[PDB]
Design a protein around this nucleic acid. Sequence first.
RNA 1: GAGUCCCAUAACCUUUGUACCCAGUGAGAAAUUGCCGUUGCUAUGGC
Lengths: 121, 153, 90, 241, 380, 362
Amino acid sequence: NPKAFPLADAALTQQILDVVQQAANLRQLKKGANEATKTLNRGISEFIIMAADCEPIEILLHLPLLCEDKNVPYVFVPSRVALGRACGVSRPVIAASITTNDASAIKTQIYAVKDKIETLL
Amino acid sequence: ARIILTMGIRSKASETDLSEILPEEIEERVKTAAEVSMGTEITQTDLDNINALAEQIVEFAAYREQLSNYLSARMKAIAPNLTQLVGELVGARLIAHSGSLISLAKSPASTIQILGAEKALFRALKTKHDTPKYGLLYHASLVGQATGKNKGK
Amino acid sequence: TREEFVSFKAHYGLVTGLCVTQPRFHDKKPDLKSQNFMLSCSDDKTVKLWSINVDDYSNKNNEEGLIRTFDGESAFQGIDSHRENSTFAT
Amino acid sequence: ARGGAKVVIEPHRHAGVYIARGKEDLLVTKNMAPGESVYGEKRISVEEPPPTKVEYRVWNPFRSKLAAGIMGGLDELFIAPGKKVLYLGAASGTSVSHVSDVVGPEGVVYAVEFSHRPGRELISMAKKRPNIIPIIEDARHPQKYRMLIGMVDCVFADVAQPDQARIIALNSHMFLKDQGGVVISIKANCIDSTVDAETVFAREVQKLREERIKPLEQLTLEPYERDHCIVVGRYMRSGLK
Amino acid sequence: APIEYLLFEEPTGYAVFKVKLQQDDIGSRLKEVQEQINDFGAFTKLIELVSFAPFKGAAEALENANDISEGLVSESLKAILDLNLPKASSKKKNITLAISDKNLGPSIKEEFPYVDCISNELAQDLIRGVRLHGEKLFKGLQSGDLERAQLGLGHAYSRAKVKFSVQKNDNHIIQAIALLDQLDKDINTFAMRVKEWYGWHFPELAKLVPDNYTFAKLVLFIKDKASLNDDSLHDLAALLNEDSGIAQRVIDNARISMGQDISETDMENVCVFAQRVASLADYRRQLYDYLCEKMHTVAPNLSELIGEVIGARLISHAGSLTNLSKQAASTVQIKNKGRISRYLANKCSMASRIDNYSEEPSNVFGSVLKKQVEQRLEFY
Amino acid sequence: KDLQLTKYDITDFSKRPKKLKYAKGGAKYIPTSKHEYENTTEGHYDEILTVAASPDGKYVVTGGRDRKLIVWSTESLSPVKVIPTKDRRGEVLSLAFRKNSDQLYASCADFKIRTYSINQFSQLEILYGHHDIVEDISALAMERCVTVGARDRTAMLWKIPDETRLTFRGGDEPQKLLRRWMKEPLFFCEGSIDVVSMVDDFHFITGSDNGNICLWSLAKKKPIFTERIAHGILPEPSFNDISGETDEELRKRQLQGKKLLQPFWITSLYAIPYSNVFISGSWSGSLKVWKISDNLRSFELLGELSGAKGVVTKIQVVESGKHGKEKFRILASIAKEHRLGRWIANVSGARNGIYSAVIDQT
RNA sequence: GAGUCCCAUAACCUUUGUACCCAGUGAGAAAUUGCCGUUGCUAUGGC
């Protein structure tokens, strides 16, 4: 298999990107590989999104190992440009983290998407 | 280090003879231990530099031997009577502690007994406890042959 | 293991007769190492043959259920099978 | 607790575990390989008689479910010095190092891990700690490493799968001795996210009873973890009754 | 069916047992029959060892372990099962063989069509009893320490599946950098001792010669300052890199030197010191070349990005290349100086991730990151 | 994005458009109060996303990320009015004048559509409809409009006086399309609807980011027609760039085949009103001209205009000819980047400019 | 008669010389062509 595994389907990618956008609106999303590693270290991440088209692909492969250590679900989406548009920033984003907030208005959607990601893994 | 220089590989354990290095009954068992050992194989590039480190260790041992011979020669040259009594090592320790052979000569015997035990000596003299029975001279050969309460005597 | 391989809702009446068989067909040979077979007869005027998957041997990496239904004019009260032939009596 | 602070190390009730007393108490284990930290934990150096330096490592209960259980008050820890433990779900080996410290040089820890990249770290750690055997293999199929593992004293299971009861049963029926111990970490979210945690724990305990593991004691790992449970039980092949 | 034979796969070989007595199956869940597995006086009434074929070596042990894990039948298994199992009929009355692994059954069935393989709970109980008792049932026919054979085979199996690479191992770099520092400190200390020991005899040469290794080589070659002459100056010009004028100035300073001529034993001791310095310097140079080669093998991109020795410093500080790849870019430590420090830290983290998670890395992205750092420093 | 509004004359179809004058905002127009109703500075201090020209011809209206609408007289190119949106969050994304009217409909990022009367410089009402930002709005002669939101994936037809809306949702399933093809390729699920245009008072057409151009009627909730991957599929990423390993077979494996391919987004789309011709533009390097069939169920591709290279942000068509023979000029504002963000990277051979195509009928 | 080991083979302190120094945060920053090159003397390459 390739190093970017698992890679989500079209419908799952759309669900994950919409959830990422809503969490970015509600300030529950941490953007970037360094910030994703920081949230994995603090333990506040619920699931991690990476982008499989980044060049090179190796610069975000440390995130799956930390995710496997901390039992955090992780997923790959095809387009870093689509991930950047979902996050709402002006530049492409290669990795994002959905942080933990108990009083969050989108907890059901985040949990459903996390359930599908755990189904992939 | 000499084992590393003689045998390179656990496969070469059977061929290479460690009888010169050691009595090697432990090495006779270490042959089977190397046959069933935990370790992996190593690159020849790594083995060359491990050999170089082992050679440095062997050369440092040779330097140790030469320095010991130099110290023994100078002890026999300047203090032969102390050498016949306590030995080159203990005599050199005593002279180094005193700073000078003349100062060590002017010290009485009670000082020479407790030389090197100043911490325990002065804490006992300041807290009214029992003093050390001996100091650097515990490593002379005769005090070692003594046993029990006869060591202080 | 004190547990069932399989349960069948076999008949609609009382299961009046039950026997365990080794069927011997003309065209084919059943796999008696992997499958066991039993005949049943009831008051719903039927005699049925069943195959059960069995895990005694591990020689390999089919069908559980109704193979053949024997249909009669009246109800059946007992059943037994022949110890060296394919025949049976109800 | 900072650098240079003095503590008093005394034995815990469990064998192979110690407590460092100070203004704040610490759970510690004796380091098999002194002078190294597995995951950047605080280490305690004790000079013991010439004096040879002896080093201890702090066991973090937020990082290790076994430490969370011991601190939360388990009664019977089957992991003891000199015993053979089958660790299922080894991962990078952070708690595996402490299990190795507890069982000591005479013990053996068979650490089964599936993924290859934490398996590299497990293999690298096994060099410094000779009593750890890495088994890079699926724990769902115990027949593959049956040539490698023989007759452990205890089975610890930290794996988080919906079928962990069948995994534990399959490994216990092969490698665990009779009247042996089984220590299980249960995550209700990883088992069944629909029903509640009490329902999940009850069903897992009943599954162990079906597979002939008798649950001795039950613990929930608060405040270290949320909806995490430890079941300690005994493998009674003869009969649970 | 009743079990006639049993196959056990040891790390040290294959074993075939004959089942003398059948344990009853209808009451196989009962307390008596479950305790008879643990008791050795009762299990011996059940089973008896017929044959044992040991493996030839560790490589064959690993090969057979892989074959058993996959479910395949090796030539060794074919040989032992051909020697022990009687030749029976495929149509009726096959020989029953108890197997621990269900997947091994079809392979053995294909090799020997007259063998029915049994892996139910009764056979699992028998195999568990054999595994539990172990060395007792083998009657001393075991030739090697079975526990150490298990330990080594488990290590070999795990290394083989992970494909562990000793070249890709970075602990060589870890030891090499600290050994390099230790050699440098020892060279400095011994060189200071050589300098001042030769200095009370000749103080001007210590200030004249800048390099420690060159000073040691020149001291060993030229020996006594009085013995130094014009021909000795021409000879030592090779060590001084054609500095014949500097050698003549050293000869003049030796003539002007007020230090007494050294004795033979003392100057032999000084030559021992100088030879020690030369050997340590040679080992330091060899270790430096080895460290550079090992960096270009293990972590190329970081090695072109900051340098082989500085990359080794970062790897040693992190503890491992994996740990360096784990830690975030702000954590990695190597106005405008602070900004370029953070930029270089980010590029170091990216290069380390590329090196650690590439199977065989290439220096292309290391060169690209150097180009980006160069562009930003040109901007500043 | 350089905060500049430039006026051009495009009257002579043969010649290039001629610049008359320009107005450039700068950092001096940043208000000192920043209290959301003191944001009445004469110039733009943030980037200008959209512009509209009033049909009578006296006024031109600019709006952008500075959260204000500036109405400028056309002769002096000077502001006669500034209108704050009076919201901290609302950036004006699209402006659309009602045809032959002074009424302006602005779509803001605070999920609103604000209607202004420009001659009176007043605000009539505001309409609240979308789950995400309202990127594009289009309006014909009668008092109604069509808006598209990005990630809600809906198109909304608003009755301005009745404050009511018809909602149109795509609801395409790539598994269903694959099953249909198997009964009879790459199917990309639709992420966001960006651009909208009105063919007539019953039909409107929307472009999405998965390349889909959809023809919608008011009577049907589903699209009547969908042309999928209309502009094309983006080039494959470089195999030597994606992985960074020495082995080219490992690099080709890390390309992961067809999965990393993504289609072009319809960045601009203009339908000439009450007509069957509409033009779609993306950064593929070619505008596309499409014809709606006479039964109005489908459209086909007439032509491809390959003159423009770069991101096509806005397409307009003007007419100058007799009723027998009309001359059409197509002007596209080609830029190196998308007007909303800088997501699209390093498109080859793109220059900022105006692309003009002059088409004469037979 | 009498505490080497607890490093008087040591530790601490002072002074001098040699140096060095005063991990986060997470979205802002800037405010026919602007400039350059080629082709015409008009076409389009780069930033």
